[PDB]
């Protein structure tokens, strides 16, 4: 339970141990018990993350020897503990700067996600409701196209490392596996029917969008073909601890998660790996079970990362800014093709504000104002 | 000899599932003015249909089989599907129009489209805007239902919807409804957080999301003063539906479902009714205006301009 940057720096007791990493991400709700911490505390069987405990992103890690598994947790604006801080600050310390603020945060979390998609064997996304946000079909689509553009800059670093042959080629130990966790939230055995339904949905969606293919190399992640990859956490009295107490008071006066994850961790600890290819002519997927030091050797070099700035400054608020700019521009014509002078000035200004507007109206407005003031 | 026109027992349709106008409602509209319209926006299982019914012509003691806006069935949940397609129409005795809609960015709709111009994903993402704009144009109040708090994607979708609408401009009111709330959500500490986040997230939206529908003055928080909040946005919470010392019930930490539903209904029927266009309309001219608005939204330009960018 320590930050990532505060760990890579500094092992001998377990400097050599075959392990499996597990990345955790997704959205959360404004509550006291995050849907991520409880997960770890539930698998390990111990209270790892205790109760009552510029940038708005973060990463955390925790290694378990009793199981030989490393856990990595991501945190960004998608959550609420961070979004609250962002808004709280923004409240104390313009429709042109805030847009850039949110855009920057989005870019930051995007690269922080690419990181996990490169140094992880298994990774899962959590959600507070059964229905899954279809918008993901786009995020992933806009993520692969990025790693490729910046793939050389990565392999050119771990190059002088013990990563291996395939690892040094794809900058990944093996095509990661994706898992889904959904919270019931009072809805509704039928659970199995719902699980299979969601699986079929996700499969068809990611397939038509081409986020998934027959080859397990070009893809940035893959799903199973015979096993289950969708878990639904039912209700539980643990949440809202106070409530639980009250319940107890009223008395003094009168498969499984771990089993759902081990079926996937065993295939890696045993060196077998994952083989997902149904193209009628499947191909073999690389694999590598590294050690602690052998893993940090590359994790540190990747975390310390130069052209990523220019590579990410092109990749969604981009479409919004584009639409706003195009609108203001196309409208500038009617603003200049209309015109003491205050009369015509205000007239053209009103015609412009009524013809189109967006997130960059200040610039296109000051421009027309200056032009008018200069044309007389 | 001054009887009324006719009473409706079930809702009707206004837009076919394939986005096609349906002229089968004039039979219930009059030449009267000063009408009020209401709309809704939400995801798959937020509880839109179950809300409008209880707000227009239904009570919690009734059964889901008598709702004027059909709800979801057990056989529909275990399969991850929807039950509301297109747009519905209903009008009560008080002469108040209610409009139900289909979820936005629904996976079931896309799944169905699979078995049937570039990618269907963009098409489904467009329909949502095509509907949101029309609602923001022909409605006085627009309710937003949610299952959990701070999705962060809805606030972006809304802002992007008010930039592709048809066209001293009109902006309707907005209500933030939180369905399936719990005890933890009925705390002042979290209440101020909610209001704070909503205010800092919709500061440049141009929509009327504040200065109305104050649940603080409706007896939901008896001993709480308005000074506790810096800016009370129009937000409402709806919870889950349901010798002497031994029979005492448990501590839930919030008011009953009936009470909140009644208060919300009373506050919704009292919303403003300003003019939409540059003329005073009746219950018929509005219908024609809306039809023209739809026909325009379809053959629009801004929507195509946004579609090409994807
Ligand atoms: N407050 C609530 N308490 C308990 N159950 C609720 C509550 N609100 C909604 N539900 C249940 O959840 C479902 C809500 O879906 P409903 O049919 O009301 O509309 P919807 O799902 O928003 O619309 P659509 O699915 O067509 O997009 C129903 O099965 C209803 O019984
Ligand atoms: Mg419905």
Numbering used by the authors:
A (entry chain B): 4 to 13, 39 to 81, 133 to 172, 181 to 275, 295 to 360, 408 to 458, 476 to 485, 488 to 511, ...
B (entry chain C): 170 to 285, 293 to 343, 361 to 435, 452 to 519
Relevant lines from the article:
Human SMG1 is one of the largest PIKK family members (~410 kDa) and plays a crucial role in nonsense-mediated mRNA decay (NMD), a conserved pathway that regulates mRNA stability in the cytoplasm of eukaryotic cells. In metazoans, SMG1 forms a stable complex with two additional proteins, SMG8 and SMG9, and specifically phosphorylates the RNA helicase UPF1. Briefly, SMG1 consists of an N-terminal solenoid 'arch' and a compact C-terminal 'head' region.
For structure determination, we incubated SMG1-8-9 with UPF1-LSQ and AMPPNP, a non-hydrolyzable ATP analogue, and subjected the sample to cryo-EM single particle analysis. The final reconstruction reached an overall resolution of 2.9 Å, and allowed us to further complete and refine the published model for SMG1-8-9. Importantly, compared to the previously published apo-SMG1-8-9 structure, the current reconstruction revealed extra density in the kinase active site accounting for both AMPPNP and UPF1-LSQ. The active site of SMG1 shows excellent density for residues 1075–1081 of UPF1-LSQ. In our structure, the glutamine at position +1 of UPF1-LSQ reaches into a hydrophobic cage formed by the SMG1 activation segment and FATC domain. The local resolution of around 3 Å allowed us to model SMG9-bound ATP in the reconstructed density, revealing the molecular basis for how the adenosine nucleotide is recognized by this unusual G-fold domain. In this manuscript, we report the first structure of a substrate-bound PIKK active site, thereby revealing the basis for phosphorylation site selection by SMG1 and other PIKK family members.
